[PDB]
Design a protein around this ligand. Structure first.
Ligand SMILES: CC(C)c1cnn2c(NCc3ccccc3)cc(N[C@@H](CO)[C@H](O)CO)nc12
Lengths: 279, 65, 287
């Protein structure tokens, strides 16, 4: 359950500044390690973030065409693994190309989605020798990924809270006739929400409700009476204000999201490849 | 020293979830899929799925990091 | 690494358990074993005095070992110990700790699916903890399919033996009942030699259920009809069992899984709120 989960306890952070602090600390730690081992080679934390966003989208693409059809919970778990790993790890130490595949592999194991390793590597668009080497690398990195998650493998995704909210709307909010039409847009918002750092800053229930009410607002449907009446927030004024502020901040997070620019992505990918080959 | 039952006190940080056996009369079960006879035979009811979904929806909705 | 090896503790289908410094280490192209991952992922999200606590996990490449607190004994050693008297208070205390752990587990929508006396561990203070979550799984989702070859055969619920793919807390509750029976008789209650033999023993002891006590029994995939055994009345099986204990046993052994008492319902029964009270942990028998 989320309310006593490790995700709530250790992987929900106070602000974007805290996440930036962690990522900058990881970047500087790799810089110090590389200098001690024996500069323009290194990537800046914003370049690390651009590469991480690009490779998270690559992870989404890998999980989208994965055969057999990977459940959405597994995909969300894998993306959360990717975000958590690169919170405290540099892409220059561990390549995101292999780390994302290891995230998908571990998520498939953790979310009880049974796929054999040959079946997993068959989903890559490479020669079988490349698939064998990729499987080897994934096996090398699986325990490392598990350790870097602090052995917190259960990920609470917004999808089941979203379904529960839809049930509650269909039950206790008759004025929202046919809440199902709010699904797709909300789902779309969910996808966009997943691109940001929201999953590290907000509860799955808050994310699901924010998506639902953003979809409702986009539909010309005003339903904070759901919050005040059905959720009994008319009593605790501060609770309703805090929930509204949380949803506003999450919508702002979605607003100020810029996808990685492919022209910048090529330069950063070449820089990262030089980082890995040189070390 | 006799034993007295005490309900588990697990703070949810969210709205109250209706009781599992109350779900049918409040109309929640009209919006979840009905359990098949073989599902019922094993002890699985649509009330379980509905209760789990509602609990997930309400869990930590008011919690702030 | 940091742990030595002191004493071999056990050996199962997936792992071997030894002692170290006290803690217990469970050493387990497919990668890290899914049983160890399931145990880690479930025990990291659970915190209750009657559930085993995972303390560490380590390995190399695809190898993995889990670290738990050292548990002094298990319920199987207690039951098989001919020199220990299992007073009604001792049985009540064991059943109470088991049910409290199971209630906590079930509110978090996880089934143990391996309940048996040797998976119920006891420490030197007498606290019973459910252990061996290598087969435990989360329940409450229609789209998650399960396999019916779960739980040891002697403690397998009849709906499992009939091939129930989807099931709830009853599969644990039935095992609980079996454990209770094994507590009362000091021998395995229904020691079947096969799934057919297990079902035969269940129906010959408790009577063959009909549709009235199990409305959809004929819908389970591997459902096999049996001769209508009258069933030995429960007061003859357990001669020294009071009416409240008989009510608890009957509730745990109801053939209908839905009607079978949940952990919360079992804990609310008069048997637990009755004289004598459950034994405190400091006085529970130790072998
Ligand atoms: C591993 C950890 C939970 C763990 C921690 N203690 N423990 C014990 N101690 C009870 C005991 C038994 C014999 C002699 C001395 C003490 C048995 C056991 N058994 C394993 C198999 O060995 C079973 O699967 C249930 O865990 N697993 C564990």
């Amino acid at each position: 359950m989320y309310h006593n989960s490790s995700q709530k306890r250790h992987w929900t952070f106070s602000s974007e500044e805290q996440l930036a602090r962690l990522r900058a600390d990881a970047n500087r730690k790799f810089r110090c390690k590389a200098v001690a081992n024996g500069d323009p080679v290194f990537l800046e934390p914003h370049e690390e973030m651009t590469l991480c966003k690009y490779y998270e989208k690559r992870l989404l693409e890998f999980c989208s065409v994965f055969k057999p059809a990977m459940p959405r919970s597994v995909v969300g778990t894998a993306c959360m693994y990717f975000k958590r790993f690169y919170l405290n790890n540099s892409v220059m130490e561990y390549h995101p190309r292999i780390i994302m595949l290891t995230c998908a592999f571990l998520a498939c194991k953790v979310d009880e989605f049974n796929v054999s390793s040959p079946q997993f590597v068959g989903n890559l668009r490479e020669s079988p020798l490349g698939q064998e080497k990729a499987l080897e690398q994934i096996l090398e990195y699986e325990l490392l990924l598990i350790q870097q998650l602090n052995f917190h493998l259960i990920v609470h995704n917004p999808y089941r809270p979203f379904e529960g909210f839809l049930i509650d709307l269909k039950t206790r909010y008759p004025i929202l006739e046919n809440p199902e039409i709010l699904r797709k847009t909300a789902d779309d918002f969910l996808n966009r929400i997943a691109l940001t750092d929201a999953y590290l800053l907000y509860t799955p229930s808050q994310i699901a409700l924010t998506a639902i009410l953003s979809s409702a607002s986009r539909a010309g449907i005003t339903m904070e009476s759901y919050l005040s009446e059905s959720l009994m927030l008319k009593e605790n004024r501060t609770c309703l204000s805090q929930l509204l502020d949380i949803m506003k901040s999450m919508r702002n997070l979605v607003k100020k999201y810029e996808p990685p620019r492919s022209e910048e992505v090529a330069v950063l990918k070449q820089k990262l490849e030089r980082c890995h080959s040189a070390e | 020293a006799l034993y007295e039952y005490q309900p588990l006190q697990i703070e949810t940080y969210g709205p109250h979830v209706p009781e599992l056996e109350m779900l049918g009369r409040l109309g929640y079960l009209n919006h979840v899929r009905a359990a098949s006879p073989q599902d019922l035979a094993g002890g699985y009811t649509s009330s379980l799925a509905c209760h789990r979904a509602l609990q997930d929806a309400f869990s930590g909705l008011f919690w702030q990091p | 690494k940091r742990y030595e090896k002191l004493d071999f503790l056990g050996e199962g289908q997936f792992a071997t358990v030894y002692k170290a410094r006290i803690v217990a280490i469970k050493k387990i192209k497919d990668g890290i074993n899914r049983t160890a991952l399931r145990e880690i992922k479930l025990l990291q999200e659970l915190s209750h005095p009657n559930i085993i606590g995972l303390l560490d996990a380590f390995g190399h490449k695809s190898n993995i070992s889990l670290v738990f607190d050292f548990m002094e004994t298990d319920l199987e050693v207690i039951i098989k110990d001919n020199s220990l008297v299992l007073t009604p208070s001792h049985i009540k205390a064991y059943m109470l700790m088991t049910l409290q752990g199971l209630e906590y587990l079930h509110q978090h929508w996880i089934l143990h699916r391996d309940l048996k006396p040797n998976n119920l561990l006891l420490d030197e203070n007498g606290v019973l903890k459910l252990a061996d979550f290598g087969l435990a799984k989360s329940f409450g989702s229609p789209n998650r399919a399960y396999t019916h070859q779960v739980v040891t055969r002697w403690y397998r619920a009849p709906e499992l033996l009939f091939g129930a793919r989807m099931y709830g807390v009853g599969v644990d509750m039935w095992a609980v009942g079996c454990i209770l029976a094994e507590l009362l008789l000091r021998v395995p209650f229904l020691p079947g030699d096969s799934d057919l033999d297990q079902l035969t023993r269940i129906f010959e002891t408790l009577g063959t259920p009909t549709e009235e006590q199990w409305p959809d029994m004929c819908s389970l995939p591997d459902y096999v009809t049996f001769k209508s055994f009258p069933g030995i009345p429960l007061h003859h099986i357990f001669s020294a069992a009071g009416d409240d204990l008989l009510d608890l046993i009957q509730g745990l052994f109801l053939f209908n899984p839905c009607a079978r008492i949940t952990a919360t319902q079992a804990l609310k029964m008069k048997y637990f709120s009755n004289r004598p009270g459950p034994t405190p942990g400091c006085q529970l028998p130790r072998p």
